Symmetry: D2
Subunit: 295 residues, 4 copies
């Protein structure tokens, strides 16, 4: 009976991308054909998480709620909470403490895109763990802006350093973390860092010192994209666009995932699609009931 | 003393791009490094128009106002009005009738990008006309979704047909129109078309029958981009991005145009830039005071 | 020891004029020539003996590019196809090359990318009999061989460019065969469109109940480059991944080194004359960059 | 009758391996080979006599592509550059070709696009003495000749790749010259970097007070393609414009027809063997598509 509680952290001071983020939050902006936040929401749904808390800024949380609602249209439970100030990833587990309660949980960042073959099998393995924590390591060209994993010769994780001056490897900790029921108390016990933030690296290092942290390599066959620059936002959009145009399939379509997980039935999906029948996205939903696709 | 009144029509039912436009209006979405509406706002400013009325939907007009304010930060006058229902381009001159008053005017669409050499000279020539109307004709591959100009052998405009089944040419009327003080009364006199809209083509055909319509060809050396599909939105963004990265210059930067037109002075521009000093856009503003550029 | 064939011949004039005097598979996909990608796919499958088939005009160009493969601890040979008379003709041109060994054919303009691709190719390479092809959901299946699947995705038929495709699953341009294929290819007759059809070869294995049709899931990119637009899209796709990762897709030097077909001294030697460009710097950094494999 | 030179020789190995066996200026920019663009720029200037300079290895490839130009009512000849020893060497290799006429040099990998470009090139082509070059604001001027401008944008100096560039204006890769240039190029000596410098030729005209330095404004695209990324960016830029307009950039057949260098019967004849691809269909539609010129 594993009902993991998912958190999407979708706040952030939001100034690197000025002026496109001046009055619209980054995680509501389009990545090709759908808002950014559809992708990490979909990642949680593909992991099996059906209870999702969306955290954003005081000003933008009504905007996320106007877009996703309570999630019942997708047979899910989506709730909202605000982060007054962007004081660190680990504050998600203080703001989301009541939502998490006594259950296992997962945190994903609202601007992180995960894509690749067998991603579901890897997320389901992380979701099924009853103890400890699971994070993922991914080779990037700029590891120094992330938590960086030091690996021994067999890729067992030895340490995690947040934004090291000399990174021990190129493997960054991705923005997706699975935890057991210790994390809320761990997050409440840690102190702000020199840069003034409650550090997810400190949470992860606590599990590491207990020898209960699983650090899974996300291989180069996966795309783990964040979108920190105007250029990389375009690059994520064209990357998504090339795949969808080639396949005739949509990445991170929550209606599709909900239907495939039996969270909604064929009548409900048709009901979502009928008012969207005049656009391409509604046509894809309509065609899910006829097009044989391996899932 | 030519103080032309500019209107940006930035409403629209907004469903072709679902779901990216579900809770954010299309004209607030990014085209590379800045919101879409910066481009037609800039076009008006490059034409010399300093008084701008922004029309959008009831729901999104506060959003445009939160982003542009009253324009005094750029030494301009920007006002707002709502379109309850998207009943046609020519309704802009009913909603904006009081704003226009007894002055000449210009209408530009909130999702139209205009770019090219000597665009300013062409817009200033259209702006300086004391009588009649000036519209622009542009060769597109899909003229049939636009007002289409029929030309004689010397490219004198003979007729304009809105969305013809068999287009007489490939020249579409762009989404930028200059009018004398007849347009508000002309717009109030016309009747909705079979498709239920107050047609700008009917306004333009009225000037045409008076022999006071100037139809100027916008040559293929210009980019006139609207962004009707997910694909063409990306294509406009990468197009802008290639030029700006090559030149080290920004397209449709309103601060720059305001400074160059002496609507704001060096102290004011520095003041806009100082709180933006941590991002690339603020660095470009800061560098306008030192970088010698022909304008 | 499976023998690989890369079919890199005449693609027609659809892309005119970019292919007017340069064969398509010599043209860049972002940062390296197109044929590097299917070459790398064969190497990832473990195939070390490769026959490159091209037009007579461009065989010295492919040979000038890849050499005999000994620089990567491989064996690369060349053969010509005077006229592009069908995929299955590769097994006539390469009959001597294949001999009595198993083989694989890949198209010189097909890109394959995704997680665990190696595990799937090694499983196909390790089969002792029959054939393996892969099925991939595309929006325009009718320009390919199309797989008809039952409810359990068992393959029932393969039709070359059907008017009404029975599914959206196209047969990708990568095929593994046992020692029957050369004799089969020699036995089939030109089709209505005048070509020796890989679909007829594959349909033979299916009717013999020795064809494995494996789904290549949507987590994979299977890209060909049949239009000017899709050539661009393949280039920007690769570019997004390499810029993000700091890693290069389809770097044959890297693959040979990781498979121990060449050692560090040989890799440094390949790198030194390239030290002034980014590609040679990437090879040099392979000796220090810890990458999981 | 001004004589045009396209310098399309050796660019080094920065783009390795995409240029390893194919010269860069034969490679595609979206839908046509790179050299089509500077070729078209010369034709838009009115230049009808073109010398293509390339490496010895690729001169048959350029010639296989463009022919003698008589198919477009032009005169196209070929010459080789054994070693890439400087832009100004084009006027030594092409000394016989230029003779006593005026000339223009354009780089085989430079793209020029924008409104009224023709009016500007025709004004340069119509000058009776001196030289004309163009200055363009770029983010990395230090990799070019850089123009020093006074407050009125009168040119004061040109420095080749200065450490501290005096402005952001680079000299673009398109130059118009009177009959002095060949003798000047024969007179200059290799520079510190070992090249015969176009900046030394241009600085000679400036000191003689016969150099016109014209700003090419930001409304123009002046694109070279020195990196893998910028080659992609040039391709997607062209693609965005052609898809929007239904028009093709740098179509030599179109330019020759509009300038009446070939007539409709000759254009139909060029089109007929290409009727099965989009390029030949575009030529055919030129006879019906009313386009302002
Ligand atoms: C700090 C913070 C960020 N955010 C948002 C803003 C961004 O969209 C996103 C990440 O912001 P950043 O400043 O980059 O956080 P960050 O600097 O903490 O980066 C993190 O990145 C992870 C991927 C690594 O695994 C971590 O180890 C860590 O490096 O989260 C919040 O909403 N609230 C916050 O408190
Ligand atoms: C009709 C309408 C549109 N809009 C917005 C929505 C879009 O962003 C933009 C244009 O919407 P459309 O449905 O395409 O309008 P449209 O169908 O009227 O197209 C017009 O296009 C011009 C370029 C041509 O010159 C005209 O002749 C005409 O063809 O204006 C409004 O805000 N209010 C309205 O009343
Ligand atoms: C026919 C042929 C093609 N080719 C080249 C041209 C192209 O680069 C590439 C493919 O050419 P086409 O005309 O598309 O081949 P094709 O039309 O035979 O396509 C094939 O595609 C496969 C992916 C499917 O599995 C097959 O079932 C089949 O549909 O191979 C040759 O070199 N020689 C030939 O004999
Ligand atoms: C030097 C040289 C280059 N080339 C080719 C290689 C490239 O495609 C192209 C340019 O080569 P480069 O090394 O960049 O040349 P370059 O370094 O001389 O660059 C020149 O660029 C012009 C735009 C400026 O106006 C000049 O002032 C100068 O900066 O010409 C030759 O064919 N022959 C040669 O002799």
């Amino acid at each position: 009976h594993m009902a993991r509680k998912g958190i999407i952290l979708a706040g952030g001071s939001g100034t690197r991308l000025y002026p496109i983020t001046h009055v619209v939050s980054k995680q509501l902006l389009p990545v090709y054909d759908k808002p950014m936040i559809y992708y990490p929401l979909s990642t949680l749904m593909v992991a099996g998480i059906r209870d999702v808390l969306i955290i954003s800024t005081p000003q933008d949380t009504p905007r996320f709620e106007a877009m996703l609602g309570d999630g019942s249209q997708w047979g899910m439970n989506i709730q909202y909470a605000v982060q007054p100030s962007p004081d660190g990833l680990a504050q998600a587990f203080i703001i989301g403490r009541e939502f998490v309660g006594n259950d296992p949980s997962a945190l994903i960042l609202g601007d992180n895109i995960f894509y690749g073959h067998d991603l579901a099998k890897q997320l389901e393995r992380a979701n099924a763990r009853t103890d400890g924590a699971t994070v993922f390591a991914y080779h990037v060209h700029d590891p120094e802006r992330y938590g960086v994993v030091e690996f021994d010769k067999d890729f067992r994780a030895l340490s995690i350093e947040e934004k090291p001056a000399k990174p021990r490897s190129n493997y960054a900790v991705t923005g997706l973390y699975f935890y057991d029921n210790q994390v809320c108390d761990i997050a409440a016990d840690i102190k702000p860092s020199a840069r003034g933030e409650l550090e997810i690296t400190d949470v992860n290092s606590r599990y590491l010192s207990q020898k209960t942290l699983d650090v899974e390599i996300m291989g180069r066959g996966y795309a783990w994209l964040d979108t920190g620059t105007h250029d990389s936002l375009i690059e994520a959009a064209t990357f998504i666009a090339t795949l969808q145009k080639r396949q005739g399939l949509v990445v991170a379509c929550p209606e599709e995932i909900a239907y495939r997980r039996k969270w909604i039935n064929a009548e409900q999906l048709l009901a979502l699609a009928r008012p969207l029948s005049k656009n391409a996205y509604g046509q894809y939903l309509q065609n899910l009931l006829t097009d044989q696709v391996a899932w």
